[PDB]
Scaffold this active site. Structure first.
Site, PDB file in Angstrom:
ATOM      1  N   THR A 159      16.982  -8.342 -11.383  1.00 45.53           N
ATOM      2  CA  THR A 159      16.881  -9.768 -11.085  1.00 45.53           C
ATOM      3  C   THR A 159      17.986 -10.590 -11.640  1.00 45.53           C
ATOM      4  O   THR A 159      18.678 -11.270 -10.881  1.00 45.53           O
ATOM      5  CB  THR A 159      15.532 -10.277 -11.592  1.00 45.53           C
ATOM      6  OG1 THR A 159      14.530  -9.588 -10.849  1.00 45.53           O
ATOM      7  CG2 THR A 159      15.432 -11.756 -11.223  1.00 45.53           C
ATOM      8  N   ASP A 261       8.267  -9.767  -5.538  1.00 48.24           N
ATOM      9  CA  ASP A 261       8.479  -8.818  -6.592  1.00 48.24           C
ATOM     10  C   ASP A 261       7.246  -8.577  -7.496  1.00 48.24           C
ATOM     11  O   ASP A 261       6.970  -7.412  -7.809  1.00 48.24           O
ATOM     12  CB  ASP A 261       9.675  -9.321  -7.446  1.00 48.24           C
ATOM     13  CG  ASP A 261       9.998  -8.455  -8.659  1.00 48.24           C
ATOM     14  OD1 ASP A 261       9.441  -8.731  -9.762  1.00 48.24           O
ATOM     15  OD2 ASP A 261      10.834  -7.567  -8.534  1.00 48.24           O
ATOM     16  N   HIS A 265       5.762  -4.647  -7.728  1.00 45.19           N
ATOM     17  CA  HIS A 265       5.690  -3.762  -8.875  1.00 45.19           C
ATOM     18  C   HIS A 265       4.267  -3.131  -9.020  1.00 45.19           C
ATOM     19  O   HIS A 265       4.180  -1.994  -9.397  1.00 45.19           O
ATOM     20  CB  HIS A 265       6.026  -4.482 -10.197  1.00 45.19           C
ATOM     21  CG  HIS A 265       7.501  -4.718 -10.409  1.00 45.19           C
ATOM     22  ND1 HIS A 265       8.347  -3.707 -10.809  1.00 45.19           N
ATOM     23  CD2 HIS A 265       8.274  -5.832 -10.281  1.00 45.19           C
ATOM     24  CE1 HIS A 265       9.593  -4.187 -10.898  1.00 45.19           C
ATOM     25  NE2 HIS A 265       9.560  -5.471 -10.609  1.00 45.19           N
ATOM     26  N   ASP A 308      17.130 -11.301  -4.082  1.00 46.29           N
ATOM     27  CA  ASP A 308      17.986 -10.692  -5.112  1.00 46.29           C
ATOM     28  C   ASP A 308      18.148  -9.155  -4.972  1.00 46.29           C
ATOM     29  O   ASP A 308      19.233  -8.606  -5.237  1.00 46.29           O
ATOM     30  CB  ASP A 308      17.496 -11.075  -6.517  1.00 46.29           C
ATOM     31  CG  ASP A 308      16.069 -10.741  -6.762  1.00 46.29           C
ATOM     32  OD1 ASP A 308      15.344 -10.285  -5.869  1.00 46.29           O
ATOM     33  OD2 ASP A 308      15.701 -10.979  -7.958  1.00 46.29           O
ATOM     34  N   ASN A 685      42.169   1.694 -17.850  1.00 50.82           N
ATOM     35  CA  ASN A 685      41.288   0.771 -18.638  1.00 50.82           C
ATOM     36  C   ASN A 685      40.054   0.319 -17.834  1.00 50.82           C
ATOM     37  O   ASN A 685      39.386  -0.653 -18.208  1.00 50.82           O
ATOM     38  CB  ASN A 685      42.085  -0.433 -19.112  1.00 50.82           C
ATOM     39  CG  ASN A 685      42.689  -1.259 -17.961  1.00 50.82           C
ATOM     40  OD1 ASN A 685      42.644  -0.902 -16.752  1.00 50.82           O
ATOM     41  ND2 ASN A 685      43.267  -2.403 -18.330  1.00 50.82           N
ATOM     42  N   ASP A 691      46.886  -0.375 -12.725  1.00 52.13           N
ATOM     43  CA  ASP A 691      47.492  -0.313 -14.091  1.00 52.13           C
ATOM     44  C   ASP A 691      48.998  -0.592 -13.973  1.00 52.13           C
ATOM     45  O   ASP A 691      49.657  -0.166 -13.016  1.00 52.13           O
ATOM     46  CB  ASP A 691      47.322   1.062 -14.644  1.00 52.13           C
ATOM     47  CG  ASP A 691      45.916   1.375 -15.133  1.00 52.13           C
ATOM     48  OD1 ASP A 691      44.997   0.506 -15.117  1.00 52.13           O
ATOM     49  OD2 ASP A 691      45.782   2.567 -15.528  1.00 52.13           O
TER      50      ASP A 691
END
Ligand SMILES: *[C@@H]1O[C@H](CO)[C@@H](O[C@@H]2O[C@H](CO)[C@@H](O[C@@H]3O[C@H](CO[C@H]4O[C@H](CO)[C@@H](O)[C@H](O[C@H]5O[C@H](CO)[C@@H](O)[C@H](O)[C@@H]5O[C@H]5O[C@H](CO)[C@@H](O)[C@H](O)[C@@H]5O)[C@@H]4O)[C@@H](O)[C@H](O[C@H]4O[C@H](CO)[C@@H](O)[C@H](O)[C@@H]4O[C@H]4O[C@H](CO)[C@@H](O)[C@H](O)[C@@H]4O)[C@@H]3O)[C@H](O)[C@H]2NC(C)=O)[C@H](O)[C@H]1NC(C)=O
Ligand code: XE8
Ligand code: CA
Ligand code: CA
Ligand code: NA
Ligand code: NA
Ligand code: ZN
Length: 806
Positions: A159, A261, A265, A308, A685, A691
């Site tokens: 989220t 949501d 769940h 989301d 990196n 790079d």
């Protein structure tokens, strides 16, 4: 401390935040424990509920009521949203035919169409079709406005990282919200879902849309809603703010729903208990649209309905436990669930060793349901490494599973049946986008796109300049009727050299050999033509790539391929070649197995050498243009030029040779020819960006030849596959990958098997957008096509997922 003794009288849901210890009446006061004593009484009225009924019509105004049905309510801006329907014979918005909104139809005093972002948590993409019979308001928005079949979230598909990516246009590694739980070792501080540390500004990087708007003189409503404020009151609050005087009224508003949501769940994504949450979200959409219709704003406001992430079936019994793998499980800290992040429990423990943890977690059980990675080795498309809050050890968990440290964590910490957080290419994690309003197109379907692109569009809808972000501005111009962003292509920074023949064979001392001294005005003039670029139109189909930084490089032409050869990195930046549907694959001839040939166009000083590979016992070499796809025995000799050679670990050459020998021709057969651009990437990196030469951590032993961290290929063909790749008159089709250049195939648990059983699976996991390769290389592709620039930007954001149909 809060002096809660001040009052909310006429301050309810005020937009400015009054400073401690003065009591607050703004929406956030609940979250902070700081509301004035009379906030609930004044600001959270519930008397008589949320709907007008026939008996209330024309009632005498009673200020106790949650909302009003008195004659004065329209001028007060506080009618119940169904007021005009119940009391004035009007229709609900959902019952009205849709009619194209060609221009904004706004009340006087409106400077711009307001934007309303309606965010729904855990709203899986397939709810739009599967739930359509019970969501008539949402279905109307979807069918009459602009919609995608799905929108791709960012990883992790949780989220807070996704909502803040929507708000900022940034990947989580850049905005800093890398999970719903985090430890920042510099702050020595922890961010959690529950509690107050999460409100501290130091977590939240980038510049979210409300701050962008405010800095540019555009006023914003609240984005965060206190969980105890009911949805009906959130909607009424937005409609009240929309009735403020011009100089006080916000232009951008947000509504958030914790559903579906919350129920997903408990019940799983398709539990029969899920129908009621979908109906209730649809009813809230209808309250909002009825409320806008009452205010004569329903053909003025742009509405975005966006989620989301999705939701997958996940139960307690599908949990892998690190205690079944690790001897030392008490010396680690795990962030658990649908992803894992591991770090040492104590920074004072000098027996802690990431290498032994990774090895103990690698391919240890036949059907193992997670895979460990050092974060730099994660697929580059996840962009999930460049932040100190992301632990070095990551576990990518298979959809439908969790990982936990010990069994006791799962029962002394089955309740749940749904969860999310997995790889953002997984179908169950995909979510929704619909845009409806004057600035969006009418009855228009657009291809799936990534949520990082939306900030730029929201800025376009508000007349704002976006802060620097990871969207590609212009790639979503096709969603919009007006307010498109018309980018120019970036300027080429380095121009190439075009070297001719400048060196004799004996000037080279590379320790290379080739059996090529095998000897004509017919054929000699022809080969000279090939070296000047006579076949370049065949193999460089969309123009040469532009180099967007300062460097020195040479264009090299050949019968079968063109390349841009870096004098600094001693290898090509890119190699471009086209393979028709009719092309034939051949073997490397026996006499040519170890052949490497000096390139008489390029100085010995700017060439690789064979001795370095002989001496580096870990490193071998491959070729960017594959000798297997040569057009003739004679053209094959070009493929062995030292200027086509690149360093490759033997384990990686297994992957590379299978791609070049088998898969390229498979793609040409399937797609009616392909154009391939391949090259090295250096990202030591792990910041996702090319790079510079001083960032390279590994060279071929004894030499200045840098070792790439990855190899990419961009594979382009005609969208209308009735036309061959090299004669395509319309839109293009692309797929690309960024393969990690690793010295083992430990990522692939089945790598002892024939490459036909594991290599393409690897490549699919490392699928990429062309834009990802652009950031990693400083190159700009597709500079010379017949297509519009915004269409090319959409092409460059495309990601080929090898997921089945949504
Ligand atoms: C996705 O889009 C984003 C946004 O466009 C891209 O990110 C930008 O990338 C740039 C290059 O990596 C980076 O530019 C640097 O800015 C430095 C100033 O940084 C601060 O100010 C900005 C502007 O307001 C701010 O946004 C920054 O915010 C970061 O930092 C805080 C944490 O401290 C966080 O709250 C926030 O989330 C964000 O963190 C992210 O970025 C930082 C890097 O800035 C990472 O470390 C985090 O992990 C996280 O990802 C900052 O508050 C500036 O100082 C840098 O300049 C150095 O390098 C240049 C190269 O030009 C060199 O010329 C200078 O000399 C200088 O070097 C000196 O410092 C070195 C380090 O100590 C030292 O080694 C040298 O010896 C020198 O002393 C640099 O210009 C820009 O900040 C970010 N912006 C954001 C928002 O992330 C991103 O690349 C895109 N991704 C892809 C894949 O395309
Ligand atoms: C999660 N959440 C909320 C709603 O928070 C948001 C809702 C929408 C948007 S955006 C930008 O998508 O429109 C961003 C946010 C953040 C979290 C960034 C502030 N309220 N309460 C609660 O727990
Ligand atoms: Ca969520
Ligand atoms: Ca880099
Ligand atoms: Na070697
Ligand atoms: Na393996
Ligand atoms: Zn959730």
């Amino acid at each position: 401390w809060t002096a809660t003794s001040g009052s909310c009288k006429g301050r309810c849901f005020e937009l400015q935040e009054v400073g401690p210890p003065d009591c607050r009446c703004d929406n956030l006061c609940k979250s902070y424990s700081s509301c004035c004593h009379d906030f609930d009484e004044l600001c959270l009225k519930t008397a008589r509920g949320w709907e007008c009924t026939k008996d209330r019509c024309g009632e005498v105004r009673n200020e106790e009521n949650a909302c009003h049905c008195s004659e004065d309510c329209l001028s007060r801006g506080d009618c119940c949203t169904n007021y005009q329907v119940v009391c004035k014979g009007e229709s609900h918005w959902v019952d009205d035919d849709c009619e194209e909104i060609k221009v904004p139809e706004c009340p006087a005093g409106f400077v711009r169409p307001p934007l309303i972002i309606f965010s729904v948590d855990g709203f899986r993409a397939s709810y739009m079709k599967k739930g359509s019979k019970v969501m008539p308001n949402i279905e109307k928005l979807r069918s009459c406005g602009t919609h995608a079949p799905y929108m791709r979230p960012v990883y992790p598909t949780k989220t807070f990282p996704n909502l803040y990516t929507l708000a900022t246009g940034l990947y989580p590694e850049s905005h800093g919200i890398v999970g719903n739980s985090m430890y920042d070792p510099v702050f020595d501080a922890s961010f959690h879902l529950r509690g107050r540390e999460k409100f501290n500004h130091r977590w939240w990087g980038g510049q979210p849309l409300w701050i962008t708007a405010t800095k540019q003189g555009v006023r914003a409503g609240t984005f965060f809603w206190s969980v105890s404020i009911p949805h009906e009151r959130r909607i009424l609050t937005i409609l009240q703010w929309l009735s403020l005087p011009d100089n006080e009224r916000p232009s951008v508003y947000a509504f958030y729903s914790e559903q579906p949501d919350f129920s997903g769940h408990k019940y799983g994504p398709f539990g029969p208990e899920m129908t009621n949450p979908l109906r209730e979200i649809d009813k809230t959409v209808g309250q909002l649209m009825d409320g806008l219709k009452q205010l004569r704003l329903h053909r003025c406001v742009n509405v975005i309905f966006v989620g989301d992430h999705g939701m997958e079936d996940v139960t307690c019994d599908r949990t892998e436990f690190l205690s079944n793998y690790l001897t030392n499980v008490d010396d680690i800290t795990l962030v658990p669930g649908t992803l894992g992040r591991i770090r040492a429990k104590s920074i004072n423990n000098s027996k802690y060793d990431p290498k032994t943890i990774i090895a103990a977690l690698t391919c240890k059980k036949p059907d193992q349901h997670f895979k460990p990675y050092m974060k730099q080795h994660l697929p580059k498309r996840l962009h999930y490494a460049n932040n100190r809050r992301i632990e070095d050890i990551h576990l990518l968990v298979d959809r439908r599973w969790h990982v936990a440290r010990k069994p006791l964590d799962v029962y002394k910490k089955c309740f749940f049946q749904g969860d999310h957080g997995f790889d953002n290419k997984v179908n169950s994690m995909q979510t929704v986008f619909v845009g409806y309003g004057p600035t969006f197109k009418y009855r228009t379907k657009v291809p799936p796109f990534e949520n990082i692109e939306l900030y730029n569009v929201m800025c376009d809808l508000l007349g704002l300049k976006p802060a620097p972000n990871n969207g590609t501005h212009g790639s979503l111009n096709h969603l919009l009727r007006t307010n498109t962003f018309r980018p120019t292509m970036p300027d080429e920074v380095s121009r190439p050299n075009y070297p001719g023949i400048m060196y004799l064979q004996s000037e080279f001392d590379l320790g290379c050999t080739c059996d090529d001294k095998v000897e004509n005005k017919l054929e000699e003039l022809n080969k000279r033509l090939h070296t000047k670029g006579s076949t370049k139109e065949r193999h460089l189909l969309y123009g040469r790539p532009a180099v967007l930084y300062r460097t020195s490089y040479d264009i090299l032409y050949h019968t079968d391929f063109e390349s841009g050869y870096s004098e600094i990195f001693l290898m090509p930046l890119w190699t471009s070649y086209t393979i028709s549907k009719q092309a034939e694959v051949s073997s490397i001839p026996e006499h040519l197995t170890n052949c490497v040939r000096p390139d008489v166009r390029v100085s010995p000083g700017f060439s690789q050498n064979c001795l370095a590979y002989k001496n580096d016992k870990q490193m071998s070499y491959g070729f960017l243009f594959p000798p297997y796809l040569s057009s003739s025995p004679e053209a094959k000799y070009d493929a062995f030029l030292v200027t086509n050679m690149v360093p490759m670990y033997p384990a990686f050459k297994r992957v590379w040779a299978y791609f070049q020998r088998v898969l390229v021709k498979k793609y040409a057969s399937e797609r009616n020819g392909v154009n391939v651009i391949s090259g090295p990437i250096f990202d030591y990196n792990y910041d996702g960006l090319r790079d510079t030469e001083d960032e390279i951590k590994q060279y071929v032993e004894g030499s200045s030849i840098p070792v790439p961290t990855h190899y990419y290929s961009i594979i382009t063909s005609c969208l209308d596959f009735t036309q061959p790749a090299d004669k395509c008159d319309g839109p293009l089709s692309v797929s690309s990958f960024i393969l990690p250049h690793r010295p083992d195939n430990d990522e692939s648990c089945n790598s002892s098997e024939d490459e036909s059983k594991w290599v393409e699976e690897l490549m699919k996991m490392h699928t990429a957008r062309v834009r990802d390769i652009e950031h990693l290389t400083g190159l700009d592709f597709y500079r010379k096509t017949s297509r519009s620039y915004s269409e090319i930007l959409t092409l460059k954001t495309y990601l080929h997922t090898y997921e089945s149909e949504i």
